Amino acid sequence: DIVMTQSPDSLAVSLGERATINCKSSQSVLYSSNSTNYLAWYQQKPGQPPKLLIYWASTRESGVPDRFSGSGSGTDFTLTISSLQAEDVAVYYCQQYYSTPYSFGQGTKLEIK
Amino acid sequence: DIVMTQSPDSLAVSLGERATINCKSSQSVLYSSNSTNYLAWYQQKPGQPPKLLIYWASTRESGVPDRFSGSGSGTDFTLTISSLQAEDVAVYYCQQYYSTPYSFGQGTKLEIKR
Hints:
Two copies of one chain form a homodimer. By secondary structure, chain A is an all-beta fold. Chain A has a single domain (1-113), classed as Immunoglobulins (Immunoglobulin-like), CATH 2.60.40.10. Chain A is built from no helices and 13 strands. Chains A and B meet through β7 and β12 of A and β7 and β12 of B. Chain B: It is found in: Secreted; Cell membrane.
């Protein structure tokens, strides 16, 4: 199947500064028919289930602040936070839903410096 | 890793009738410390990513109509739809997020019996 790997497992940045989380798929998740990457990013604050943040690799889900943005294609993707805020402290997960079983990466813990 | 299996892979019922999709986990996702199940249900329509429908096994997400309700505990869960409506036609997936890697079931196609 498709294995997803993230990097790092955790990281910290000062409030106000940028942060980037990387994710690699063991296989391509690009659907050529409509040239789209079936990749998503989830935000998980402790005490809550994972919440959809970004899909199609770069499309933010409604409600998500414009400071979150996704990029990448094929097998390498990145989640970018332009200005870390207190509420952004959480564990992020990338996921591919190109072929079943849909799979997640191991997760990356984001914290404040 | 925990393995999620659903039954059946596809099914159909008449509009206004009930439908049930089952999901098994190879290992319990019941969390003893809080006695809650780390189980979720998603609805996926064509051209869109799966969308969170239910979490904690029975908590309905915001905006989700009461026709949808989840049940089960440990390793056996069930998604129920009391009155099938045309917009409920989609593929449903269960997910465990008790222990990484979080995982999905193979998906169940819900169709309208004409």
